[PDB]
Design a protein around this ligand. Structure first.
Ligand code: NA
Length: 374
């Protein structure tokens, strides 16, 4: 049996083929997804996934996230010098000139961190299988190069996986939607993840996939919505109580967790409550706040627009037109947001397909591909 792994910028998922259907596997915490976050506590203990995530704000200098932005990359790559500006942790150039990460004097390569994430996936998958997992199919962005694909392939080996193949994410998702046997059909893939946004235009002819165009934004994702919502919450609190939280990470850690929760609520509801008791201390100050969908949409209107232009360029570079696109599938949890769904519809001129879970589709596709190989 061959494991399929979506090693994501922000979140990872693992699925395997059970019969004629792919089964997504859930970790020891009962979650079907795992944060691609790795951190080292002051003492030197290592944390991976949710544990690291729940410390990300209080321990910024030693928490590694969005490493996938650095994997397979040279240090002087504009994409790395840009990332340095947007992340608090330290990036240093290895002896190769490759982009590395440093924490507490110990430095790691992006492939090592990925390996830490892949190790837990491996663990997660093995619980299911019973035996040990040896063979994997891991996914990479269409825009990845050899250097990036090898480094991803190398990360799998460190964790003890033989990466039989590396397939493109957009292609993987298309597999999850059954487009494998399409005679002729042009597909647009709108992937808005926790950390990156991707638009990829695919054509399938007699079952052969071609990536015609690819565009997007490396620094626009779901986390950016959370932060914009956090600033709004923080700013609204100063007004009402006069307390400024910016300097208290322990509280900011809670707000982020709370901002992450409100966002999810507002894709199924138009209102939710931000309730954070004893956030600070003339006495305790409790954070009680009401957030509505229309408000949220307003707060992150600019995050959404920024998707509109890359998708237009994608079709241009692919010499296509809304009429030409036969289907549009959504990938990324941030695609659950209705306003994202609407912006996606009046962009490609059709209702987006939402049959497959937005953030398990790639893992599922990776499974399909792996079942084929076994
Ligand atoms: Na990703």
């Amino acid at each position: 049996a061959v494991v399929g792994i979506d090693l994501g910028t922000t979140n990872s998922c693992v699925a395997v083929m059970e019969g004629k259907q792919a089964k997504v596997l859930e970790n020891a915490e009962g979650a079907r997804t795992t944060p691609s976050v790795v951190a080292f506590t002051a003492d030197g203990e290592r944390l991976v996934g949710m544990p690291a995530k729940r410390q990300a704000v209080t321990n910024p200098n030693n928490t590694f996230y969005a490493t996938k932005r650095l994997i397979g990359r040279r240090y002087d790559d504009p994409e790395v010098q840009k990332d340095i500006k947007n992340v608090p942790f330290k990036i240093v150039r290895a002896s190769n000139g490759d982009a590395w990460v440093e924490a507490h004097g110990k430095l790691y390569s992006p492939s090592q961190i990925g390996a830490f994430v892949l190790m837990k996936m491996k663990e997660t998958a093995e619980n299911y299988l019973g035996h040990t997992a040896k063979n994997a199919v891991i996914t990479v962005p269409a825009y990845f190069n050899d250097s990036q694909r090898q480094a991803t392939k190398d990360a799998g080996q460190i964790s003890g996986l033989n990466v039989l193949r590396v397939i493109n994410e957009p292609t993987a998702a298309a597999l999850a939607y059954g487009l494998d046997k399409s005679e002729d059909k042009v597909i647009a893939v709108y992937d808005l993840g926790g950390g990156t946004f991707d638009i990829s235009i695919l054509e399938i002819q007699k079952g052969v996939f071609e990536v015609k165009s690819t565009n997007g934004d490396t620094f626009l994702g779901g986390e950016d919505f959370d932060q914009a919502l956090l600033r709004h919450i923080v700013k609204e609190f100063k007004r009402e109580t006069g307390v400024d939280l910016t300097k208290d990470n322990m509280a900011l850690q809670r707000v982020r967790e709370a901002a992450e929760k409100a966002k999810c609520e507002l894709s199924s509801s138009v209102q939710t409550d931000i309730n954070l008791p004893y956030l600070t201390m003339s006495g305790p100050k409790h954070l009680n706040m009401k957030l509505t969908r229309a408000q949220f949409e307003g707060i992150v209107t600019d995050l959404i627009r920024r998707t509109i232009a890359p998708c237009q360029k994608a079709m241009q570079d692919a010499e296509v037109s809304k009429s030409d696109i036969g289907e549009v599938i959504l990938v990324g949890g941030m695609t659950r947001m209705p306003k994202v769904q609407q912006t996606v519809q009046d962009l490609f001129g059709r209702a987006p397909s939402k049959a497959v879970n937005p953030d398990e589709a790639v893992a599922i596709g990776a499974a399909i591909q792996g079942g084929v190989l076994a």
